[PDB]
Swiss-Prot record, chains A, C, D, E:
Function, in words: Self assembles to form an icosahedral capsid. Most capsids appear to be large particles with an icosahedral symmetry of T=4 and consist of 240 copies of capsid protein, though a fraction forms smaller T=3 particles consisting of 180 capsid proteins. Entering capsids are transported along microtubules to the nucleus. Phosphorylation of the capsid is thought to induce exposure of nuclear localization signal in the C-terminal portion of the capsid protein that allows binding to the nuclear pore complex via the importin (karyopherin-) alpha and beta.
Keyword Hydrolase: no
Reported impact of A80I: In strain: Latvia
Protein name, UniProt field: Capsid protein
Keyword match Chaperone: no
Reported modifications of this chain: Phosphorylated by host SRPK1, SRPK2, and maybe protein kinase C or GAPDH. Phosphorylation is critical for pregenomic RNA packaging. Protein kinase C phosphorylation is stimulated by HBx protein and may play a role in transport of the viral genome to the nucleus at the late step during the viral replication cycle.
Included range, full protein: 1 to 151 of 183
Amino acid sequence: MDIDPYKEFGATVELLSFLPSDFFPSVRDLLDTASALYREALESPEHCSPHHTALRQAIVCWGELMTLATWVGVNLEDPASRDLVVSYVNTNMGLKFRQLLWFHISCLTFGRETVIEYLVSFGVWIRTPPAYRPPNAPILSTLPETTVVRR
Amino acid sequence: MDIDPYKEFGATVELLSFLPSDFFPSVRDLLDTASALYREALESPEHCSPHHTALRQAIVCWGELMTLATWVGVNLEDPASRDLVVSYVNTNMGLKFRQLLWFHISCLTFGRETVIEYLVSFGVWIRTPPAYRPPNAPILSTLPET
Amino acid sequence: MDIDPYKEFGATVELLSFLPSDFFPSVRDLLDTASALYREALESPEHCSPHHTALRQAIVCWGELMTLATWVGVNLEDPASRDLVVSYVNTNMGLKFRQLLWFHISCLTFGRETVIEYLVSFGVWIRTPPAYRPPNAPILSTLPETTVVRR
Amino acid sequence: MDIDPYKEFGATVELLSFLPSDFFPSVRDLLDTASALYREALESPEHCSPHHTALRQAIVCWGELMTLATWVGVNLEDPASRDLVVSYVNTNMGLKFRQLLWFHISCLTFGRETVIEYLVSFGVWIRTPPAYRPPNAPILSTLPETTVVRR
Amino acid sequence: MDIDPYKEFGATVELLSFLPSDFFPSVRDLLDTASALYREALESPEHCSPHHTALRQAIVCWGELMTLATWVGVNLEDPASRDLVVSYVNTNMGLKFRQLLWFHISCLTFGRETVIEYLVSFGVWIRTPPAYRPPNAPILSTLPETTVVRR
Amino acid sequence: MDIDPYKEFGATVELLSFLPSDFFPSVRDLLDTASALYREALESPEHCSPHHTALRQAIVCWGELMTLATWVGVNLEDPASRDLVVSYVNTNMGLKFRQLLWFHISCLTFGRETVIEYLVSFGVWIRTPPAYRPPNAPILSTL
């Protein structure tokens, strides 16, 4: 079909194509952020929000893909094809999962309006040619880059 | 007829020449930004804005220019002239379209007054000597302060 | 994308396919009608109407295409390919511009309802086989074909 | 100085450029019509209307042009060049004066709005290919379509 | 006659004498800034403000100076003396016109009080020895110190 | 740009083309008139009038030209080139500067409408053929 898992939330696959391919953190770092900020709500028995539902589903499917990787590394004798499949699962399927994770963790941490405005502004930034581009790329944050809160 | 594509919007061809010619993103990146942000409005059977009207027209005209370039590639046998024509369509007309798409997408995203003050300020900045101007190049951003 | 520059106004590319390919006036005649009826409004600094916006954009792009034609006629040494490109720009791209011009000038002069009704009626006329087709094709006009207004 | 003699009245040299060369009566017939419809007003010491002012001026410059033609015919001994200049004066300048006289006589007879809509509709008719238009040009006249003066 | 072109506006040739020679954009950049910020007001038939009057006059005298430079380059056969005069016109008189254009464009952009306090503070900064002053000259700009145009 | 320095003051360059090139007094005479009539107001720190602003600007741009001329006469060793360029500075730019000074001093002294009617009347006088042209050329005066 044509689900396009972001258009339900307000972004699209092409709106997230503003961000380059290597912009997204690693799958380990994104799973660490998830378990560090929303573990007790991702394990609760209630529909907390659509982001929580989609994030639970994403994590279960990555778990199914990591079980696949373990199984193939255990069961395939041909090492060339074995490492081929494992590297494919880890990188080429991993990129789609990291784009999915980044989006959900960031839209939970900062908000839909903030994440969409950040996507637009980072599109502007990465579009602007290098010679006329400021060094301060836009970034998501809840505090100013320097925070003078003495006590 | 001596028509400005920007005079009704409050800009001018010389006001968009006030920025470096290589400041504007590629036509590919700008068409991607348009289809990523306002596709459902650039395909609806409503006007919704002079910017949507002008942006629909601009994209149709670029599609016609790209069909021209494909036709040239297929139907010109002389490679020198063929690649000269294609390079012209991609660089001169491509620069004019990138200046046009940038203006309309940026206006729709940020605001007419915001984009005009940005044009003026970035033009003044790129001309101020380096030691007496803020060090970071100006940029447009929807992300507020925290 | 799928802009279809008429569906914003109420027609479509297929509704304007009722009219044959050679029905549309020349680009020179349509630019003359434009500069004879709406020049002071096409050069004004205000959004007069969506037809005016689209017509300004169309005229600027035809100007860009005529600058292309001048450039190629000046810069291409190979005469065969030069005249090939110039004839292409003038006829095959010209037809699309004349369909665009005719539509906008007529919808400004006569009105959207009148232009759409004319498209439907000319579809009926040009569809009817020649033997059962009246000689009076439908035409757009603000006066009767004969106008007895003595003084 | 690039002056349009109709722009003052609402027409345009590009709006009257559609009426074919054979559309206008001869200079003699248009002068007879002027002197038989508005002689007592084109010979009065009163500012009657802009059409009267322009008609007076046009007739004076045609008188000067006819004096020119007579002088050429009398004083150019070369018959070839003499007939060349006479033909030029009687056809090119003659057509311009026929277009100018027709416009003013017809404005005075019918009305500004009437003659302008007539020019518009005749442009629409003369731009259509001969195969898609009613075969009888639109007519501007004071007579009924039956041409029977009752009462 | 010992006229101060800024004393009328509140500055003084001795108040602008502190801004170094490298502080001002080139004549070309300052003319581009003028013609891109206030062209429709520097070309209007209206007395807009003393800054507009002085800007019009300054630009006319620079036009005369550029005509002089072109005439020198064309008509002085001696290359040494020709380049000598051209260098003089482009550097000395050029610096005076850069100082004059900067002052008027900056007044029109920012304000009399703002540009005067800026000149005062820049004088304080440029008079201090390099060892007792903050290393970054004071800046007059419309951009935020972050140079990110939001809203 | 097409700034046209007289447009704001109500004239145009083609209106001042009514007066010939050899009609305007020397720049010396015009500067003498200025320093005799409006020195205390051109040296004042006040926007007295747009004519005062334009006249201050013109006087400063002429002072810069004269400094250029002196600098050239001192520093250019080639006498031919030096005399050529100083003669250019004195005549070809002095012409436009005495046009500007004439316009502004005359407007200040007599009035905008008076100077404009003078320009129109001088157009009439210089267009009239010589056989029907009075020997008394038009002249500006408040007497």
